[PDB]
Amino acid sequence: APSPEEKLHLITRNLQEVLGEEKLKEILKERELKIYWGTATTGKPHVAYFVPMSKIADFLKAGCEVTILFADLHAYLDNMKAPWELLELRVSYYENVIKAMLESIGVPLEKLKFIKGTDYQLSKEYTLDVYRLSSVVTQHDSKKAGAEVVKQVEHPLLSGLLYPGLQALDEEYLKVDAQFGGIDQRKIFTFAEKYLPALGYSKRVHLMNPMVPGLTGSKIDLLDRKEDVKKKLKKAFCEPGNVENNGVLSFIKHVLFPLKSEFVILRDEKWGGNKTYTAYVDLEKDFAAEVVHPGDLKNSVEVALNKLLDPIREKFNTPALKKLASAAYP
Amino acid sequence: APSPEEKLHLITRNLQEVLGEEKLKEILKERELKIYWGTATTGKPHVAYFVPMSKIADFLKAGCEVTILFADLHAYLDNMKAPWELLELRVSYYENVIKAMLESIGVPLEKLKFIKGTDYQLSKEYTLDVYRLSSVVTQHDSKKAGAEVVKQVEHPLLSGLLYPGLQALDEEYLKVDAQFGGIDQRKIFTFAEKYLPALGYSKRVHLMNPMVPGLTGSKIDLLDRKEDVKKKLKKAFCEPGNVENNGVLSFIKHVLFPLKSEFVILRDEKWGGNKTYTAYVDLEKDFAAEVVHPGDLKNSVEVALNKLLDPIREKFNTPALKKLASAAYP
Ligand SMILES: Oc1ccc(/C=C\c2cc(O)cc(O)c2)cc1
Ligand SMILES: Oc1ccc(/C=C\c2cc(O)cc(O)c2)cc1
Ligand SMILES: [Cl-]
Ligand SMILES: [Cl-]
C-alpha cells in the first residue's frame, strides 16, 4: 500500500531503459529501494531540470530512500580559478532550488538526503579505490565510457578519463542499490556494472530517462517572472499534429502529466471546451488528430508551469535567497 | 668546510646530467640541499642498488638533508592480490637493507629520513592536488612522460597515466629542493618541472645518474655468500681493453672508487704488483692499455664487494632479520 508492483510502476514509468530488473524486483519484494541521482553544480538550473526532478518525486512517492549528490569536485575541476567559495555558494543555490522544486511538486522529503562529492570523494578509502580501479581499467575503456559525457577537446585531459571511475565509486560510497540518470549516461552506467565487481562491490540497477527535447526549442529560468515565461513559451516550436518531436508535449509527458496522472487542456467552447486526459496516449492521439492546437497546448503548459514556479519564486524572494542567487550567479 | 664548491662537486660527481644548476648553486651558497630518491618496494634489491646508494652516501657526506621514499602505493598497484601485509614486510626489508648498505659504506645518517608513499599519498590535500594536475595535464603529455618507466602493454592501464603526476607531487609533499634518479626518468623529471608551476609549486632541481651496465652481464644478491659472489663474478663479461662497455669498470667507477676516491688493483708481481689509483681516468687508461687484466679487475672488485657485503650479511643473520627476509621473499 503501495505494493511492490505499484512501487515498480512509479519508479520505472517514463524511463527509456531499465538495467537490472531482476535485482530491482528482488529488492522491492523486501524493502525500500535506495537510489541516487547526481548533478554537477555548474550552470544555473532551468526548467528542463523538472524532467529529472519528476523522477525523483516518483522515487520518493514510491517510498525509496533517495540521495541527491551535488558533484562539487567535478565543478571545481572545470574551473580551478573559480574560488571554493563561489563553488560552494553554487552548491547552496542548487540545494535550495532542488528542494524548492520538490516542495512545489509536493512530495515527502523524509527520505531525501543531500550530499556533496567533497564530503567523501577525498577520503582515504575512496581515493584508494580510485587507484585500485585505475590499475584494472584501460585508458581505452575509460575513454569510451566518457564519450557522450566528457567534451571531446583537441588534446583530451587526464581528468576526463577519471570521471567514469569516480561515478562508479559513487554508487558504492553512497551505499545505494541503484542510480538514476539520462540514457546519455548508459556507457558510464555499463562501465560501473562491469568494473565495480572487480573491486568486490556489487553492480547496481541503472534507471535511464530518455533525452527529452527542450521546451523552448533564454531558456526559461526557474525564477523567471510570469511575463517572461509567457513570452518564452509563445516563442517555442510546436508543430500542429507533430507528436514525435515536440518539446511542449514532452514537458507534459515527463513533468505535468505525472503530477496527478492528469492533464487539462484549456480550449475555447468553439473547439469543444476544456478536456481532461487521464492517460498521456489519449492527449497524444488528440494532438496527432489536430483537435488540440499548438497555441492551446502552450497555454495549458503555461498555466501549469507557472503554478509550479510560483512557490519557488516566492521562496527565493526572501533577502537571504535573493542574496544567494546574486552571489552564486554574478 | 666543505665549501659550497666542494658540496656541489660531491653532490654532482658521477652524474650524467644536472637540470637546474642555477638554483642548485643558489641553495648551496646559503644552506643544505634537501633531496630525495624514490624506490618502489617490489623485487628483492641486488648489488646494482649500490649505484644509487653511492650517490645517496655523497649527498649525506655533503651535508644534504636526504629523504628516501619507499613507494609502497606503486607496489600495491602492481599486485593488488598481494596483501598489504606482504607489501609492508617488503617495505621493512627494503628499509633495513638500505640502511645496512649505507652503514657498510660508512656515512652519517643524522639527516637521513625514510618515508613511505602511503604516509601522505592518500591524504586529502595530496589527492586534491592529483585532481588539479589531472585537469591541466593531457593524456598525451602523461603518456609521453611515462614511456621509459611504465611498461608499454597491449591496452595500457589508467594507472600508468597517473604515475608522472604522483611522482611530481612527491617533490612538493616531501618539501625537497631536488630529486635524484636515473637518466631514464628524464621525461618524468621535465614533466615535473613543467607542471608543478601550474599548481603554484616550484620546479625542482633534477640530478640524473647514467644507465650503468650490470656487474654480471642470478644477479648478485646483497646477502649472497662469498662463494656465490666469486662464482657470479667469474662468470661476468669483461673484455680486455674495453672501457666503454664494462660493467666491472662501471661498478668501480660508480661505487668502489668513490668510497675513498681510491682504488687498488691487485696484480701479481710479474705484471708489476698492486697499483693504487687516485683518479678513475688513470685506471681506465691502464685498462685500455691492457696492463690491468680482466681477471685482476674482477678480483679487485670481488674483494672490495665482499668487504661491502660482509656487514650486511652479519646484520641480516639475526633471527629477527632472517625471519623478515624469509617472510618478505617467500
Ligand atoms: O556520481 C555522479 C553522478 C552524477 C554526476 C554528474 C555529472 C557528471 C559530470 C561530469 O563532468 C562527469 C561525470 O562522470 C558526471 C557526477 C557524479
Ligand atoms: O616520487 C617517486 C619517486 C620514485 C618512485 C619509484 C619508481 C616508480 C615506479 C613506477 O612504477 C612509476 C613511477 O612514477 C616511479 C616512485 C615515486
Ligand atoms: Cl518519451
Ligand atoms: Cl659513466
mmCIF file of C-alpha atoms and ligand atoms in Angstrom, chain A residues 14 210 250 253-254, ligand 3:
data_model
loop_
_atom_site.group_PDB
_atom_site.id
_atom_site.type_symbol
_atom_site.label_atom_id
_atom_site.label_comp_id
_atom_site.label_asym_id
_atom_site.label_seq_id
_atom_site.Cartn_x
_atom_site.Cartn_y
_atom_site.Cartn_z
ATOM 1 C CA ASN A 14 8.603 7.421 -18.136
ATOM 2 C CA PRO A 210 15.081 9.457 -22.390
ATOM 3 C CA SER A 250 7.425 16.039 -23.762
ATOM 4 C CA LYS A 253 4.552 13.760 -20.693
ATOM 5 C CA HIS A 254 7.543 13.907 -18.298
HETATM 6 CL CL CL C 3 9.405 9.527 -24.359
#
